[PDB]
């Protein structure tokens, strides 16, 4: 017996607040990405990189956000890192809007974002993916999954776990209103190492969990246990992350150091 009572309306207001803030913080939404990927937008059709000849044309004529490395695999990887550094800033801006978050101890805010940004990056990356590939340069290009897989070792396997995650995750058909609450749940995780004060984090999480549950009930009439399934994904996501980390160390051991993002070069 669900009712539309004061408590439920406050959880809906919380969900809308998050949605609005998510729209502000993340320019390329899932709705806008799906419209591009399904050819149901009036916006500019992206350039497709599906082989090396199209990569060269893409970098040349179109100019993609990726002394540059002479090798394609390294330019791609470095581009992904750079974009992820920008993603940290977007995610931090979003975290400031979660009610209660900025009233936490600053060191705990930091620690929550430090351990949560990689999970949120991979969650939101799925929005830009379909079975064929991923949107790049804010939707101006599209790079195929099979092209990414064809990069020389160790870069050929770099995106594959993200695509594998995405196929299954996208099958749940979450929308941006669902995702805004989900990513707030991930940020307010009380089990991150090195947290000072866990209960206030858990109290914010509990309210966000309530809001997610209700959002999912109202928005997904045909998946009665979607809440549980999403919590299971958060359990998963930690593995894309645990395995990115292993991959990175192989990369940093065996490849030339690549350029630092300007923001870091500036920080030191």
């Amino acid at each position: 017996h669900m009712q539309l009572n004061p408590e439920s309306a406050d959880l809906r207001a919380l969900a809308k607040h998050l949605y609005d803030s998510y729209i502000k913080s993340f320019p390329l939404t899932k709705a806008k990405a799906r419209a591009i990927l399904t050819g149901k937008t009036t916006d500019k059709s992206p350039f497709v990189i599906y082989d090396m000849n199209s990569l060269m044309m893409g970098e040349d004529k179109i100019k993609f956000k990726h002394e540059q490395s002479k090798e394609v695999a390294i330019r791609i990887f470095q581009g992904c890192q750079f974009r992820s550094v920008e993603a940290v800033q977007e995610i931090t801006e979003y975290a400031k809007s979660i009610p209660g978050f900025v009233n936490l101890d600053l060191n705990d805010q930091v620690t929550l974002l430090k351990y949560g940004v990689h999970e949120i990056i991979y969650t939101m990356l799925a929005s830009l993916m379909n079975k064929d590939g991923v949107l790049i340069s804010e939707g101006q290009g599209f790079m195929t999954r099979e092209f990414l897989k064809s990069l020389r070792k160790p870069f050929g396997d770099f995106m594959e776990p993200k695509f594998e995650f995405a196929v299954k995750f996208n099958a749940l058909e979450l929308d941006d209103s669902d995702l805004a609450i989900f990513i707030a749940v991930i940020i307010l995780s009380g089990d991150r190492p090195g947290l000072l004060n866990v209960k206030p984090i858990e109290d914010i999480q509990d309210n966000l969990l309530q809001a997610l549950e209700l959002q999912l009930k109202l928005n997904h009439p045909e998946s009665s246990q979607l809440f549980a399934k999403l919590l299971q994904k958060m359990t998963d996501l930690r593995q894309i992350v645990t395995e990115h980390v292993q991959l990175l160390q192989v990369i940093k051991k065996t490849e030339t150091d690549m350029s630092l993002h300007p923001l870091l070069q500036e920080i030191y």
Binding site: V85, V88, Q89, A95, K96, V110, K114, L264, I267, Y268
Partner: peptide, 12 residues
């Protein structure tokens, strides 16, 4: 380290 400096600045 850098990750942490990125975040602190963004929060400020």
């Amino acid at each position: 380290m850098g990750l942490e400096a990125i975040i602190r600045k963004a929060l400020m």
